[PDB]
Amino acid sequence: SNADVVYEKQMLYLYVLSGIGGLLLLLLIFIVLYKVGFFKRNLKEKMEAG
């Protein structure tokens, strides 16, 4: 059923913005820690679920 929310405010722009911001901060935080030496003092696993 299509309600009157698609024209009002799906409020999805918030979920999509929060998701893109967290991923970018995760990639930058991992590289910033591995470059400074933080992650350079441990045997990472580099996991990745499918």
Swiss-Prot record:
<comment type="similarity">
    <text>Belongs to the integrin alpha chain family.</text>
</comment>
<feature type="short sequence motif" description="GFFKR motif">
    <location>
        <begin position="37"/>
        <end position="41"/>
    </location>
</feature>
<comment type="subunit">
    <text>Heterodimer of an alpha and a beta subunit. The ITGAL alpha subunit associates with the ITGB2 beta subunit. Interacts with THBD. Interacts with CD226.</text>
</comment>
<protein>
    <recommendedName>
        <fullName>Integrin alpha-L</fullName>
    </recommendedName>
</protein>
<comment type="subunit">
    <text>(Microbial infection) Interacts with SARS-CoV Orf7a protein.</text>
</comment>
<feature type="transmembrane region" description="Helical">
    <location>
        <begin position="13"/>
        <end position="33"/>
    </location>
</feature>
<comment type="function">
    <text>Integrin ITGAL/ITGB2 is a receptor for ICAM1, ICAM2, ICAM3 and ICAM4. Integrin ITGAL/ITGB2 is a receptor for F11R. Integrin ITGAL/ITGB2 is a receptor for the secreted form of ubiquitin-like protein ISG15; the interaction is mediated by ITGAL. Involved in a variety of immune phenomena including leukocyte-endothelial cell interaction, cytotoxic T-cell mediated killing, and antibody dependent killing by granulocytes and monocytes. Contributes to natural killer cell cytotoxicity. Involved in leukocyte adhesion and transmigration of leukocytes including T-cells and neutrophils.</text>
</comment>
